[PDB]
Amino acid sequence: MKADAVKIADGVYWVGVLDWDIRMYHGYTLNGTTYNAYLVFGDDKVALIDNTYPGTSAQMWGRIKDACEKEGREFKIDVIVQNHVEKDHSGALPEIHKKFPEAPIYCTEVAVEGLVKHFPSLKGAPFKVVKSLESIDLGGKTLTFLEAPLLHWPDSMFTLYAEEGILFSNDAFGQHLCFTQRFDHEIPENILMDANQKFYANLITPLSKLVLKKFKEVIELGLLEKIKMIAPSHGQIWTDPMKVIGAYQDFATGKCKDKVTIVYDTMHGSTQKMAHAFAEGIMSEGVDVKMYFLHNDERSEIVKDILDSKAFLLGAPTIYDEPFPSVGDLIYYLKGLKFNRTGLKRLALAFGSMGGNGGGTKVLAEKLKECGFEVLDEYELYYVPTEDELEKCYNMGKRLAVKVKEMK
Template identity: 35%
Template sequence: MRPVEIKKDIWWVGVVDWNKRSFHGYSQSPLGTTYNNYLITDEKTVLVDTVDQEFAGRMFCNIAHVLQGKKIDYFVINHLEPDHAGSLAQAVERYKPEKIFTSPMGEKALRAHFHNSADWPVEVVPSGKSLSIGKRTLTFVETRMLHWPDSMLTYVAEDKLAFTNDAFGQNIASSERFADEIDRSVLRRAMAEYYANIVLPYSPVVLKTLEAVAAMGLELDTLCPDHGLIWRGAAEVRYVLEAYREFALQRPQPKAVIAYDTMWHSTEKMAEAIADGLVAEGISVKVMSLKANHHSQVMTELFDAAALIVGSPTHNNGILPLVANLLTYVKGLRPQNKLAAAFGSFGWSGECVKILSEALTGMNMELVEPAVKTKFVPTHEALGQCVELGKKIGQAIKAKTGN
């Protein structure tokens, strides 16, 4: 995609990765993604972030198109993760910038990523520091742990614009550059998917940062994330800030996720019966086999759900590996305000539900009991217990969500 001038003399010079399906190797990105970076052509020419190394060549083409032979004076590096700083070494070599601005933690991360950076002209900018580049002033604001210690945003007061790096991004490859050009429900889903799988553990930081930004009284009418679509206009800025506040609050909806794996379908039958109980209580349910659904898809569904119900047969005195994988993944993302329950089939020793229940309480989820465990193929009666468990969870969800 060619460069796009998003405001006078502020250009998108990034790359669309239409084929990306595994984001950072752990999360699915079914719609692809973009690596957005930006060029400001003021008295000083400033490059804000770079792109994944794989696409450095395309970024250089886009930059050349805008520069028309001019040089780049400054780099601003808002975050050192390789999807944004991956082309930094090549860019330094090519443009020989006068200065590279980054946060205090950014400098540390830069040195640990680029071992040949000793002679780079790195200048650490403390949070709140401003820099004149001609008609414009850049202000750097640390956003520590959103989502790395080095993360910062760069604010351009004159344009009421902020380069927010990973914050407010979405994994969407598109020919459009602005959020208002895309179907809103697709966009909202992609925002939630991104938040649930990347930003969620830092929700307390999101709330504090939103408060801090409000207190700073920054005027904002454009937010430029480093993935996906750009938010333009005051109404769009309000929309995305409010969406992040809602995401961070993690208010559960009347919805449950049943995630399970099975060898011979007994645990699967139990999953269906629990779903029937939930539906009887008017709760929306997603029944997710872990063979059919990637852990990141489960996380996206769990994000706004009130309950996580996990099933596994007993396998070698333990649980099946796909279920253990999901539990590890969910634990790291620290979802809040969830009810939980466990179920599974077994043959002789039957450790499954104990292991699942402990894992769920270990994530501060509130267990709805009794967990259901059946010997080999569930009887009609055992499936009845599953329906009852589903109803009980449904009632607890209604009490929790006020529905």
């Protein structure tokens, strides 16, 4: 395939892959994404930083050939860097190693066993284990490695091109966006920061304390102000790195809007009527609302909006003494994401309709507490809400919205 590389600095190219057509990626909804790989031309050695998903390398190889041609160099890679073992960034490593078998593969210690377990043909490949602050010289360009375990996997690391302050952060600071434009400043800010928020919410939330720890280490090494560009493994390249670092600082410390996310499911529409009545009460106080119906909507957008919501409402009818089962998916996901690690226990209310002994709302309230929410109340009613019962939902939403606006 013929495909052009994109220069991001002198002798540095994006040689990634545009996954135009993907719409679901591990339960994360998106309108395509990219697998960003980078090619650094030192005077002596050419290094490839990360690669792409298995079967998607046609664009990558085309862009690598284009970059070598633009540099007046032979089609050759001398050094391979693997920041992360997950196959969306390591999937072409078997073919890169087969093509360039003498190129060493720089990665963390735990990455070696992980990569060989993913790709058995790499057994006996020239792996070179790296540690934080160790560097390699490409000839006028230096790559410095920085271990970042559990940001987001135990094998994860960042690679810094020291002379120009370009941080190849792999997943950290990435966003699932697929545009012809490669840089942060070339697309609308709302699209960029909404995709960044969704990426943090789904991938970084349980790591919020480690984010702040990594930031303290990066500032104590005096290297924060040296970062001129962040080139992540998905989406746009940050020419304004402090914009995304600032967004991460806000998400990791529980900075939220005066906003409530409401999620519900229904069989006969009664829980839906309750959800809409809670929203009316919240809106009467000028507090924003995002409304999700689990029949149609899915977990990755829901958790994006919870991330900057001060409160979360969850509603479902009772079926055989349990809440309607679709909530189980979201609850299992919230149990993993651990929103309390942002330093904020978001307020919550459980609600629902029932037709006998009930009990679904009590289960929801207990699960919301396990997920780190501050459950203020619960409201369960019999079949179709009356006018007085919808006014109670409105009043509960109104009183919640007052508490939301009072919250620091």
